[PDB]
Design a binder for this molecule. Structure first.
Ligand SMILES: C[C@](O)(CC(=O)C(=O)O)C(=O)O
Ligand SMILES: [Mn+2]
Lengths: 18, 429
């Protein structure tokens, strides 16, 4: 689930800590 | 307010406060050793164990270390395993554990922790709401929906559950059904409802069903700081970047890339047509619920700054050409892709996720009538062999009413005012 053309996901960036 | 001391911990309150004073004074390293000695001497004390965890948490912030944070996450868990843990402390410890697990991207771990919280505190609505977010963050919208349905059956006016339930309904293309939940939820003013995602989707849902009140919600999302403007509604932004719907090549500074696209446009076209003719499965249908009707597919060569090697086997000369331009191949918030659209297609008004990219379109096969694109209040057409440039963080819309297919090449570039530091650091989208 990635935001390519729109803003449809709850979050568009990954969570990778610090 | 929060009672964190059990019977035994009250008897050592002086030693516990002495260690906590060190933490609040900022002497993190002395605080850790103080709480470590208390854990050694009182291995069963929940307050000592939580003090150790909080100091490890603070230390991970000072050192910006995922490994130190993983230690803290384990110590917050240890708190919960000790005997006679007061309920306020148990909740604080596991709540922080889950939050820090999410910060590290351990979404599966956070979910197990959230499921335990709900089992332990089955009447705490806010924890169920947090469990639903855990499911959303792992992409499990079916279980997230079940959680918010359970919350709303008990507390029908919980605004956090309303906006999240509406978000899920809209993501499932239940547009009309989502509107009252998103609106009622935002209007509730409950904590967590004043969030740009919910103004964004409420306005878009209203646009799709022809409710002219949509721009009142964009207008209010703007006044509350979520949108740079009513027309530019992206949510992953760097503030200060020049905001214009339409751009010229010279305005972008990427004139060499544009010249290369325009001088070599026919080789780009021919590789796209060859894929259409011999490898059409490489074109994937659009899957972000952006069409009202019609057929629209994309064949992607780069995404998140990463070359798709198998895809480039289908357009090898185009991939070789583009490798000379890191302004696009390294744009980790954009893509490089062919886009085919057929007659009878209407793409809903929509916005991209970030203001950190600009989008170039190169015309490849353009019917003489029927195809057009609007960005903000201005509509334009494509030309074969020519580049258009727009900022897709502005609302835009597309129609295809020709009598044959329309093929363009899409090349995203970093917004030109982003520094090399920002281009290296921004998280990928
Ligand atoms: C729908 C579209 O892909 C254009 C578009 O929305 C975009 O590039 O952001 C097309 O006309 O092919
Ligand atoms: Mn678009």
């Amino acid at each position: 689930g990635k935001c390519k053309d729109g803003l449809g996901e709850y979050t568009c960036t990954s969570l990778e800590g610090f | 307010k929060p009672k964190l001391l059990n019977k035994f911990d009250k008897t050592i309150k002086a030693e516990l406060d002495a260690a906590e004073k060190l933490r609040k004074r900022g002497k993190i390293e002395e605080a850790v050793n103080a709480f470590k000695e208390l854990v050694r001497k009182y291995p069963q004390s929940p307050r000592a164990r939580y003090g150790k965890a909080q100091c490890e948490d603070d230390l991970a912030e000072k050192r910006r270390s995922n490994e130190v944070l993983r230690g803290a996450i384990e110590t917050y868990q240890e708190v919960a395993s000790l005997p006679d843990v007061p309920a306020d402390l148990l909740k604080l410890s596991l709540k922080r554990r889950s939050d820090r697990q999410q910060f590290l991207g351990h979404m599966r771990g956070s979910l197990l922790t959230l499921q335990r919280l709900v089992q332990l505190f089955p009447n705490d609505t806010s924890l169920k709401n947090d469990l639903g977010v855990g499911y959303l963050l792992i992409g499990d919208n079916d279980n997230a929906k079940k959680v918010y349905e359970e919350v709303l059956s008990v507390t029908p006016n919980d605004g956090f559950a309303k906006v999240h339930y509406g978000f899920i309904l809209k993501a499932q293309n239940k547009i009309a059904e989502s509107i009252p939940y998103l609106k009622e939820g935002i209007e509730s003013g409950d904590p967590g409802t004043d969030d740009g995602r919910f103004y964004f989707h409420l306005g878009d849902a209203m646009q799709r069903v022809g409710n002219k009140e949509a721009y009142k919600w964009y207008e209010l999302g703007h006044k509350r700081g979520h949108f740079a403007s009513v027309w530019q509604r992206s949510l992953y932004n760097v503030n200060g970047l020049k905001a214009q719907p339409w751009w010229t090549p010279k305005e972008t500074g990427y004139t060499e890339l544009v010249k290369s696209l325009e001088r070599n446009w026919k080789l780009i076209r021919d590789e796209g047509l060859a894929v259409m003719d011999k490898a059409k499965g490489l074109f994937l249908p659009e899957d972000e619920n952006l069409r009202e009707k019609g057929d629209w597919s994309q064949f992607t060569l780069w995404q998140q700054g990463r070359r798709n090697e198998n895809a480039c086997k289908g357009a090898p000369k185009t991939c070789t050409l583009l490798e000379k331009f890191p302004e696009t191949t390294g744009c980790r918030r954009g893509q490089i892709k062919y886009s085919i659209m057929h007659p009878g297609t209407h793409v809903w008004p929509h916005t991209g996720p970030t203001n950190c990219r600009l989008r170039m379109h190169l015309g490849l096969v353009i019917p003489k009538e029927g195809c057009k694109i609007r960005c903000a209040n201005e509509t334009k057409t494509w030309e074969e062999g020519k580049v258009l440039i727009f900022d897709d963080s502005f609302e835009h819309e597309v129609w295809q009413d020709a009598s044959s297919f329309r093929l363009i090449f899409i090349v995203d570039v970093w917004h030109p005012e982003l520094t090399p530091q920002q281009r290296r650091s921004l998280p990928a989208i």
